[PDB]
């Protein structure tokens, strides 16, 4: 039984340590550890409920926007506020555009170099690389000439002997299975992605006031002043500018990102056969479109036993079934109180004891839903949508499968979605569907303004006395996010965040059940224990965010 540690795990957000036991070239047991804590839950305590979102947004700047919106939703929940529909349109556009940037960056900047060897890309024939994409994609930047410009940038980087960021990576590793040509294709796409994600953030910026960290929200709605005829406010000219960037996203997402995920899968088919993190999945519905915080564009729900037939829909952020099930345990985390806590009754009292395989080993709490461990994130959200018979999701998944089929002569069944590649696929599908969310919600805003509705804000009435508890759900890039606020005598008496990477990276829980990261690693083949590329591959599929996991 050989012991390895990967610390730091790079190409994630935040500070993560992964330990594995390896027996007979295969990991037999794992531990995931969040190694940095800030105490954000305590930092926002005792403040006006209206101030929380600006503070708690700083839980993470990668999934910026998410904690901000979840925080206001939680205050709105506590105070029984109906959000103006214009304010929902605005929040929705921001969330969808942000998640667009987020998924693109995760696939390319954070994940690609797990599966792609840049040194191999040097050996490629650009003409052949370009040719093998004919009839596979309509992207306009797949020319031999584009690929050569990219190849020369790599050559020159290598020539300088300053590889920097790209130095000492897993080049030449036995698990790198792409031909030189598709290595070069992917690197060219990596660079192109950076343009696409910038456009996505320009959408976020025009509504948020900037990004990272938007600044246009309020408990009660948004701070954008809608006035078609106003100077210096959200007028038609500004809305046209927003639309201009929304329109630039779809092609890269559909013709590159979507196609590259089927291509990666085609060359790594056994990764559809490992990396399962859980048999239980949860997602919240997202993108409300009425004046009552409901009518979501995306459905949510709960699946158990890896069986879509068990699908229990969740179509309301006020669903008591969802609210009552959630608890967190610090039995194996560095906090004092170890029994499972409902977040409204949660505590976060640090108790650092150092690393113990059998005791406490992480700053991440271990969440459960009615006692079960649950994977959250795009896989969970895809499975829920499939189970809900959302035609759009089936159609989009089938589009990716169809490309995989053209490439391999094989198909992908729902059973193979419980896997490292299935998880990657769920995220790509999410990103693709979000482009229609952006178009629909922009149009809805335009038409609603046309009807004469410029309302963006409902003034919160926060009573000077009495206790109020609120919970704000949000389906973030990485999974179901929830903020839990208790107000007492007009100020925050308790605040607890249960974040998607908390579900996934959580350590062993109150009954010692390992979390999704830890479960997913069991069975991972290791060619070289000094270069455990294979574990990093699986862990990256969850898109770890540790400032999120720990806060």
């Amino acid at each position: 039984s050989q012991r390895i540690t990967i610390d730091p795990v790079t190409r994630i957000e935040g500070h993560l340590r992964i330990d594995c036991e390896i027996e007979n070239g295969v990991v037999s047991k794992a531990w995931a550890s969040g190694t940095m804590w800030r105490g954000m839950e305590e930092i926002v305590k005792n403040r006006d409920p209206r101030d929380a979102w600006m503070i708690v947004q700083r839980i993470c700047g990668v999934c910026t926007t998410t904690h901000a919106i979840s925080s206001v939703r939680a205050a709105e929940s506590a105070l029984n506020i109906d959000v103006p529909v214009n304010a929902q349109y605005i929040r929705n556009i921001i969330l969808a555009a942000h998640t667009t940037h987020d998924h693109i960056v995760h696939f390319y900047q954070l994940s690609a170099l797990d599966w792609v060897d840049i040194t191999s890309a040097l050996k490629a024939d650009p003409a052949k690389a370009s040719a093998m994409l004919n009839g596979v994609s309509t992207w306009h930047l797949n020319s031999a000439e584009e690929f050569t410009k990219v190849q020369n940038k790599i050559k020159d980087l290598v020539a300088s002997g300053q590889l920097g960021i790209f130095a000492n990576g897993c080049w030449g590793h036995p698990a790198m299975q792409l031909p030189p040509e598709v290595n070069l294709i992917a690197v060219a796409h990596y660079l192109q992605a950076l343009e696409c994600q910038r456009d996505a953030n320009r959408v976020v910026a025009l509504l948020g006031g900037k990004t990272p960290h938007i600044q246009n929200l309020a408990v009660g709605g948004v701070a954008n002043p809608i006035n078609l005829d106003g100077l210096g406010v959200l007028n038609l000219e500004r809305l046209m500018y927003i639309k201009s960037f929304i329109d630039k996203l779809s092609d890269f997402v559909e013709q590159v990102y979507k196609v590259d995920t089927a291509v990666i899968a085609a060359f790594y088919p056994e990764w559809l056969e490992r990396g399962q993190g859980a048999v239980n999945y949860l997602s919240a519905p997202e993108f409300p479109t009425d004046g009552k915080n409901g009518s979501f564009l995306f459905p949510g729900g709960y699946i158990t036993d890896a069986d879509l037939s068990t699908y229990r829909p969740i179509t309301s952020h006020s669903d008591e079934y969802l609210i009552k099930g959630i608890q967190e345990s610090a039995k194996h985390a560095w906090y004092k109180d170890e029994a499972p806590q409902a977040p409204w009754e949660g505590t976060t009292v640090p108790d650092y004891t150092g690393w113990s395989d059998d005791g406490k080993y992480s700053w991440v709490k271990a969440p459960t839903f009615y006692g079960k461990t649950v994977e959250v994130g795009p896989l969970a959200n895809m499975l829920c949508k499939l189970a809900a018979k959302r035609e759009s999701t089936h159609a989009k998944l089938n589009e990716i499968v169809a490309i995989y089929t053209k490439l391999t002569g094989k198909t992908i069944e729902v059973a193979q979605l419980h896997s490292t590649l299935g998880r990657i696929i769920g995220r790509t599908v999410h990103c693709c569907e979000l482009q229609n969310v952006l178009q629909d919600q922009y149009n809805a805003l335009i038409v609603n303004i046309g009807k004469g509705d410029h309302t963006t804000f409902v003034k919160p009435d926060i009573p000077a006395t009495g206790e109020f508890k609120g919970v704000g759900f949000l389906e973030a890039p990485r999974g179901m996010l929830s903020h839990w606020m208790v107000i007492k005598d007009g100020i925050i008496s308790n605040y607890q965040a249960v974040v998607p990477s908390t579900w996934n990276s959580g350590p062993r829980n109150f009954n010692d059940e390992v979390g999704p990261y830890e479960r997913s690693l069991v069975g991972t083949p290791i060619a070289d224990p000094n270069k455990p590329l294979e574990v990093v591959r699986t862990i990256h599929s969850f898109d770890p965010c540790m400032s999120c996991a720990v806060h």
Binding site: T5, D7, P8, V9, T10, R11, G14, H15, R17, T35, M36, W37, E42, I43, K45, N46, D48, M54, I55, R58, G61, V62, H101, L110, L157, S160, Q162, I165, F166, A167, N168, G169, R198, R202, A205, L206, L207, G209, K210, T211, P212, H213, Q215, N216, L217, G221, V222, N224, P225, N227, G230, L231, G232, P350, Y352, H454, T456, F457, N530, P532
Partner: protein, 268 residues
């Protein structure tokens, strides 16, 4: 042609400061990393992980001794002997003091690294402090904001590379080109402030005419920065008050994350 080496260490960071680079346009991140500098260590972007990436750090620290610029984002937690941020089994405060030894220049990017920021607010659970407090005797360039416009950082690095010296700094060691003036002393809504034209509530008449946000709690009057001029994301017209929300004072110690959103600023 050799590019200037940079070593980037993340302490208690939300990664927003690294993310700001992905919005930059002069240079873009890809041009930054392939043309402008050699980014020798960065946890978020490095191909290598674990032992391999820590090798890269050790190698770069040695090879470029006296030449690299060291960038730090996030606050530094000193309580309980540094354990609130541990990478590769060691307090981040130790990684940072080691790297600071052979640094040509040192930049604290973001309010967390510059003065403690949000992570040191309230009761300060981890005893988080800014970079200057952990590196006494060293000259720290502070580029505050949460996160700053990435060009506040990029143009600072460029000045260093192009003219061999840091840009002109104020008393708090902030580059004057970006932090030399109160936002309120260069804000386009000042005429409305002067006339008594104020938004009183989001969505009201004044708000929808683009009037001054002082009475919504704008911290412009007590916040140094370039948010009203350079603004954000290079699309034109984008900063928090332009969008309709008061400045929160995220640049300025004692303001952001200390005062309420709707709490009024002092006006000189």
């Amino acid at each position: 042609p050799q590019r200037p080496p940079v070593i980037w260490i993340g302490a208690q960071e939300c990664t927003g400061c690294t993310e700001s680079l992905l919005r930059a346009t002069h240079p873009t991140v890809e041009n930054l990393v392939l043309e402008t500098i050699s980014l020798e260590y960065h946890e978020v972007l490095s191909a290598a992980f674990g032992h391999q990436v820590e090798e890269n750090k050790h190698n770069a620290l040695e090879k470029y001794k006296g030449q690299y610029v060291l960038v730090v984002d996030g606050s530094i937690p000193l309580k309980d002997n540094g354990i609130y941020c541990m990478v590769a089994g060691e307090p981040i405060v130790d990684h940072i003091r080691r790297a600071a030894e052979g640094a040509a220049a040192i930049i604290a990017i973001g309010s967390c690294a510059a003065w403690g920021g949000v992570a040191a607010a309230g009761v300060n659970p981890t005893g988080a402090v800014g970079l200057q407090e952990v590196l006494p005797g060293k000259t720290i360039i502070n580029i505050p904001g949460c996160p700053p416009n990435p060009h506040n950082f990029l143009a600072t690095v460029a000045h260093i590379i192009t003219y061999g010296k840091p840009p002109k700094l104020d008393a708090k060691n902030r580059p004057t080109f970006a932090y030399g003036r109160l936002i309120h002393e260069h804000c386009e809504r000042r005429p409305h402030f002067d006339a008594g034209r104020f938004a009183k509530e989001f969505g009201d008449e004044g708000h929808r005419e683009g009037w001054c946000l002082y009475h919504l709690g704008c911290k412009g009057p007590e916040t140094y920065g370039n948010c009203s001029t350079l603004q954000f994301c290079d699309v034109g017209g984008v900063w928090p008050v332009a969008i309709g929300h008061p400045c929160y004072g995220c640049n300025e110690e004692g303001i952001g994350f200390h005062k309420g959103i709707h709490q009024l600023a002092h006006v000189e």
